[PDB]
UniProtKB/Swiss-Prot annotation:
It catalyses: Preferential cleavage: Arg-|-Xaa, Lys-|-Xaa. Belongs to the peptidase S1 family. Its cofactor is Ca(2+). The keyword Membrane does not apply. GO terms for molecular function: metal ion binding; serine-type endopeptidase activity. Keywords: Calcium, Digestion, Disulfide bond, Hydrolase, Metal-binding, Protease, Secreted, Serine protease, Zymogen. This is Trypsin. Disulfide bonds join 7-137, 25-41, 109-210, 116-183, 148-162, 173-197. It comes from Sus scrofa. The keyword Calcium applies.
Amino acid sequence: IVGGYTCAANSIPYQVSLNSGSHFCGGSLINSQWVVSAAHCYKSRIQVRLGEHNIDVLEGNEQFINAAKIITHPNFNGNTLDNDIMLIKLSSPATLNSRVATVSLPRSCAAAGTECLISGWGNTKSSGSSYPSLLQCLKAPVLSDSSCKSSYPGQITGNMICVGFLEGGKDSCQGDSGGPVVCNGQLQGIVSWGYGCAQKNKPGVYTKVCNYVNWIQQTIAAN
Ligand SMILES: [Ca+2]
């Protein structure tokens, strides 16, 4: 997260870190047994870390739970990043409390201008790279589909939304991938891609979660 601020500890209690030795992607806890992330974060083995603030230090509220199922959208395309969505089923249920809590799927797609909260442990620099120990947060608005397409001609499918700022300076970045865009208590976006990070007229591009809620319920029901 570039241009954000350090979240208060455990104030984003649905945020998870995906770890395969080290942190590599984010995700969001949507029920006690299932995490939503990005298919481009897929690995064949993943440990989900819940209840994290400092990902480098044990603080007493962490839950480390292995992914028993790692399910990507069958028509994910690694080049266009269309259908950039993944579901993880935990090998045991997360224990829910004030520091580890679920976020709701969206009831409807978010309107342009809706204020969201994006979070993660990704790169905090618009040029070069620095990775934080403490979870970062960024308030940012959904941008219109027309603005998104103007910023990324030929690259925006119906399964993608832009969120952030055309001016530059505030965006998600590598390492935030798979993490949450939450607006009015609903997971509307998954950190997916962008041109660089926090560059002028290159806002972040996010998986449009409202298009996938039926796929999510069918996948849960089959697993
Ligand atoms: Ca920790």
